[PDB]
Design a protein around this nucleic acid. Structure first.
Ligand code: MG
Ligand code: MG
Ligand code: MG
Ligand code: MG
Ligand code: MG
Ligand code: MG
Ligand code: MG
Ligand code: MG
Ligand code: MG
Ligand code: MG
Ligand code: MG
Ligand code: MG
Ligand code: MG
Ligand code: MG
Ligand code: MG
Ligand code: MG
Ligand code: MG
Ligand code: MG
Ligand code: MG
Ligand code: MG
Ligand code: MG
Ligand code: MG
Ligand code: MG
Ligand code: MG
Ligand code: MG
Ligand code: MG
Ligand code: MG
Ligand code: MG
Ligand code: MG
Ligand code: MG
Ligand code: MG
Ligand code: MG
Ligand code: MG
Lengths: 50, 262, 205, 151
RNA sequence: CGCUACUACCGAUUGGAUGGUUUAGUGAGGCCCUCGGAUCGGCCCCGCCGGGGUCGGCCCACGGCCCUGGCGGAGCGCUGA
RNA sequence: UGGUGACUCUAGAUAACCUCGGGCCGAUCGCACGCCCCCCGUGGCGGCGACGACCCAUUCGAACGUCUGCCCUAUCAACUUUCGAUGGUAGUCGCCGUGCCUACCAUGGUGACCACGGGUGACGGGGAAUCAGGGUUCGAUUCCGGAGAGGGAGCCUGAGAAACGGCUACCACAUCCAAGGAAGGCAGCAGGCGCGCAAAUU
RNA sequence: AAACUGCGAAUGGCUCAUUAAAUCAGUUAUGGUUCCUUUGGUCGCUCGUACUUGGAUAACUGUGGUAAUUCU
């Protein structure tokens, strides 16, 4: 499972490869355009919304 | 077919263009315009085959894109433009004027005219109808629509149009004793005086014409174009005055010309 | 799809013919526009040549003309009562050409009372509202009263139309095709035709 | 009464019969003005069409049709359909090889207006061409002339 | 009548075969109608940043009335697709 | 008012309507640039074209109709009408006229002058071979019409297509695949297989 | 250059399977229809921010998925 994350204010894209079920649990059973809290990705993403 | 056709086979072209068979497979299909496809002369045919100014179709385009040719006083760059009966062609570069008039053989002839004569043309009234607000409208043989015509002008009459302004100067009524030319059928290209008109309700009318030499013939009403009032035409006539000769007297004239040559 | 050609039909002698070409675009047909009564709903159809056909699916108003009085007014459509072609159309309340419908009478009554200045459609109880009283009993000068009195000479309506006005609904016939132009226009029934359709409606029940 | 035999009201579309009038003019006569036209080509309108009360939208004189095309002739053979009859046209076809002819016939279904009555089997009829009125009908009866045995 | 060969006919019977029809029962897909509403906007309610006028206590401070550019949150409020 | 052999034609008048899936009534581009005013401006005016557009007329057509005309076959003599066959009335649909379709009605329509059915090594003509005068046979084939794109069917766009060097399915074949999928139509020019007595350069 | 927009791609070329009043030929009709384009005519004929109004999308710059396509 890869994640292509885009920051529009800076307009920067980054592809991150994640091998962890816990990090992907919060994104399961979600439809498009929904807002999620990306805290499970790690300690860097505290307060980020995706 | 599923729509309009865009080509014309050379052998299927009108025979008054006098095209040869071995030059190519196709012939210039006339563009849509004032005159019918079977009753017009394309600009390229007149420009390279009649006048010998150009040798190929490319040179006709090179001439036309210099805006040298004018038809009825307006510059046309289309090389397949349909030019028809009683049209005026002007070339200011060489100072030449021509009028498309049928000869006694039923072919358009290279007929040079005075630049003073090139300022007007004759048209045949095809339709008269009253439009919105009670305004009369007159439609000619070359798709010209004129508003507020003279109340005395009816169908099958002739009107003189000034090419610069496109307005009627005078007119000739369709009556016996006037001068007419045949524009279609077996008697195409003949000039004469109307003798009588036969009316057939629900069908075509038949009109009898007699030429200067006394030869009589008949045509349909749609094939007659009134040229002048009485015996005086309002336009210049080609080399032949509209009298059709028989084969025997054409041979006699040719032999007499050969004997006097040399 | 739906084809309205002629080569699928038997010959005059009765023998069948083998077709020589398949279905063509210009021979097509389209499903019928069953126009009902309700809030307006119209769909446009792109037809041959790039033109439009207005396919009315629901209509509730239309302009009808009182021919004898030459009074054309826009009135709502209430119900469908008779249909010459088929009685199933009446049951489903389908608006087609030449169908007999019921329309409101109020605008015609207003025009009649404003023109002739006579009561119409009023009960015998003579109950009134001041607006109607000043419409009918307004103070006019000698010249205007002279014209109104002269108009009162020709103010006379048949008993059938008067009874319909008392009922509040008039019988009308639709002359336009709702499925083709998108509007339901017609004329108010009167005269021998009104008697004919009244007899037909009564006999149907 | 006799005219009104269909589920729909039979009316002449171009005549307005609901024009109101004073009570004095109503007592006189309830005579609807008749609509008729001259079809041209020298054919005269039968008096029964002008004075009649029938309703026929396909009648050449009181209906909405136009006569243009060919004018043909035939002999009446069958009168069993409603307002339309079947006539027979006889001719000879030439065979080049034998320099002779053979007898041939055609059948035409034509529309007969109510203005023409007392039409019997075996009399001559002159018909004119119009727009297709039905699947097989393209001609309308213009004139009727009786047989040689008329007394 | 007894020899020698060929073609064409019948006719125990059922095979390898295809092709053409139709009775009934299903029936892809497009099109039309009646629903449906993932989602995307615009208008109102607040809040703080910014520019034009004016009004008020007025002296380079701060509110009122409108507009105006952005940003954040509500209302199953309204509306359009 | 004007016109036709013939209008329910064109034009005129009156009362209204005028579709949100909405008719028009210019928020477009180029080249030369100049005359005028109590003026220096919100400056006013102006020449040729290009593009676009509601509606008439014209041109190129297309589509439905009228009359006459086609090869053998009776070991094909009655056919059509339940599921439209013939006609009437009112509607629907269609770009329009019409059983084109629907509802209610009448019993009609065709046929030894050959209907109906069957066969055709049948696309139709302009034409070709042979021929004293008659006639017999051929016409797939460069021109004019028709039909088709492996067989059917249904559509989008567009002025115009039931289009196939467009799409969507079924039927028959058939290509790549990492087995999850993706992509097909030479009766266009060459060329290849097969078929055959029988026909050319990738 | 690329891309958006406009037009054409319904012409041409090939073949003769179907098709026997069907196709087709001559002769008439559309007063019973539609018509890109060309040509001509109308285009202050309506009495009710304008010194020019609004939001997006490619090409481009960057991040990617599939064994595979003129996929996105
Ligand atoms: Mg072609
Ligand atoms: Mg051309
Ligand atoms: Mg076919
Ligand atoms: Mg002979
Ligand atoms: Mg379905
Ligand atoms: Mg009028
Ligand atoms: Mg009808
Ligand atoms: Mg009928
Ligand atoms: Mg043959
Ligand atoms: Mg064949
Ligand atoms: Mg011979
Ligand atoms: Mg011989
Ligand atoms: Mg041939
Ligand atoms: Mg042939
Ligand atoms: Mg063959
Ligand atoms: Mg095709
Ligand atoms: Mg093919
Ligand atoms: Mg093949
Ligand atoms: Mg296929
Ligand atoms: Mg187009
Ligand atoms: Mg196809
Ligand atoms: Mg191909
Ligand atoms: Mg093709
Ligand atoms: Mg090949
Ligand atoms: Mg290939
Ligand atoms: Mg050979
Ligand atoms: Mg070989
Ligand atoms: Mg493009
Ligand atoms: Mg196109
Ligand atoms: Mg070739
Ligand atoms: Mg023909
Ligand atoms: Mg039509
Ligand atoms: Mg046009």
């Amino acid at each position: 499972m890869k994640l292509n994350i885009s920051f529009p204010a800076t307009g920067c894209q980054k592809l991150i490869e994640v091998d962890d079920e816990r990090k992907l649990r919060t994104f399961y059973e979600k439809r498009m355009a929904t807002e999620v809290a990306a805290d499970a990705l790690g300690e860097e993403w505290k307060g980020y919304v995706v | 077919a599923r729509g309009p056709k865009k080509h014309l086979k050379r052998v299927a072209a009108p025979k008054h263009w006098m095209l040869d068979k071995l030059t190519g497979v196709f012939a210039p299909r006339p563009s849509t315009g004032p005159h019918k496809l079977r009753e017009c002369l394309p600009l390229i045919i007149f420009l390279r085959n009649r006048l010998k100014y150009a040798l190929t179709g490319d040179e006709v385009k090179k001439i036309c894109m210099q805006r040298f040719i004018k038809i009825d006083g307006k510059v046309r760059t289309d090389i397949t433009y349909p030019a028809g009966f009683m049209d005026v062609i002007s070339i200011d570069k060489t100072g030449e004027n021509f009028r498309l008039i049928y000869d006694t053989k039923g072919r358009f002839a290279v007929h040079r005219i005075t630049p003073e004569e090139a300022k007007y043309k004759l048209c045949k009234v095809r339709k008269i109808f009253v439009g919105t607000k009670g305004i009369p409208h007159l439609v000619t043989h070359d798709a010209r629509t004129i508003r507020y015509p003279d109340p005395l002008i009816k169908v099958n009459d002739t009107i003189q149009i000034d090419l610069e302004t496109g307005k009627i100067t005078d007119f000739i009524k369709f009556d016996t004793g006037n001068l007419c030319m045949v524009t279609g059928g077996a008697n195409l290209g003949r000039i004469g005086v109307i003798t009588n008109r036969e009316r057939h309700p629900g069908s075509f009318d038949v009109v009898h014409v007699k030429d200067a030499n006394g030869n009589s013939f008949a045509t349909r009403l749609s094939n007659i174009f009134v040229i002048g009032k009485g015996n005086k035409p309002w336009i210049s006539l080609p080399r032949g005055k509209g009298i059709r000769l028989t084969i025997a007297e054409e041979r006699d004239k040719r032999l007499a010309a050969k004997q006097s040559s040399g | 799809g739906i084809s309205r050609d002629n080569w699928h039909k038997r010959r005059k002698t009765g023998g069948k013919r083998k077709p020589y070409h398949k279905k063509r675009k210009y021979e097509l047909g389209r499903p019928a526009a069953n126009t009902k009564i309700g809030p307006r709903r119209i769909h446009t159809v792109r037809v041959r040549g790039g033109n439009k056909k207005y396919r009315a699916l629901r209509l509730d108003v239309g302009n009808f003309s009182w021919g004898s009085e030459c009074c054309t007014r826009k009135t709502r459509i209430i119900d469908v009562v008779y249909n010459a072609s088929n009685n199933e159309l009446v049951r489903t309340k389908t608006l087609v050409k030449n169908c007999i419908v019921l329309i409101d009478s109020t605008p015609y009554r207003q025009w009649y009372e404003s023109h002739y200045a006579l009561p119409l459609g009023r009960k015998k109880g003579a109950k009134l509202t001041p607006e109607e009283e000043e419409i009918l009993n307004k103070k006019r000068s000698k010249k205007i009263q002279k014209k109104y009195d002269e108009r009162k000479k020709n103010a006379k309506i048949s008993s059938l139309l008067e009874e319909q006005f008392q009922q509040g609904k008039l019988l009308a016939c639709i002359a336009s095709r709702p499925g083709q132009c998108g509007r339901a226009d017609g004329y108010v029934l009167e005269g021998k035709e009104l008697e004919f359709y009244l007899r037909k409606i009564k006999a149907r029940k | 009464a006799d005219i009104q035999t269909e589920r729909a009201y039979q009316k002449q579309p171009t005549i307005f019969q609901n024009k109101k009038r004073v009570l004095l003019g109503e007592t006189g006569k309830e005579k609807l003005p008749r609509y008729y036209k001259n079809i041209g080509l020298g054919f005269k309108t039968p008096k029964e069409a002008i004075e009649g009360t029938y309703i026929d939208k396909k009648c050449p004189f009181t209906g909405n049709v136009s006569i243009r095309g060919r004018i043909l002739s035939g002999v009446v053979t069958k009168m069993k359909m409603q307002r339309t009859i079947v006539i027979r046209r006889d001719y000879l076809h030439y065979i080049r090889k034998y320099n002779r002819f053979e007898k041939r016939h055609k059948n035409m279904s034509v529309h007969l207006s109510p203005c023409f009555r007392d039409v019997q089997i075996g009399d001559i009829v002159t018909v004119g061409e119009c727009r297709p009125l039905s699947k097989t009908v393209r001609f309308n009866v213009l004139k009727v002339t009786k047989a040689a045995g008329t007394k």
